Structure 1
């Protein structure tokens, strides 16, 4: 695997692929 800048929507899409079934949280203000 690798390291890239993931901004905006791209970040939540990466989390979707990574977490899938498990779900995730997206909390910018933290």
Structure 2
């Protein structure tokens, strides 16, 4: 595939794509 900068809503859209039904966590504080 590729590696790119994914930030903000773009990051969570990428998480949605990759994880889908599994679900995911977005925890920027870390």
Shift of 1:23: 0.1
Describe the superposition over 1:1-30 as per-residue Cα deviations: whole angstroms up to 9, x where unpaired: 000000010000000000000000000001
1:5, 1:21 → 2: CA distance?
24
Gaps of 5+ in 1: none
Q: Report the TM-score, using the length of structure 1 for normalisation.
A: 0.95
The number of aligned residues is 30
Q: CA RMSD in A?
A: 0.3
Gaps of 5+ in 2: none
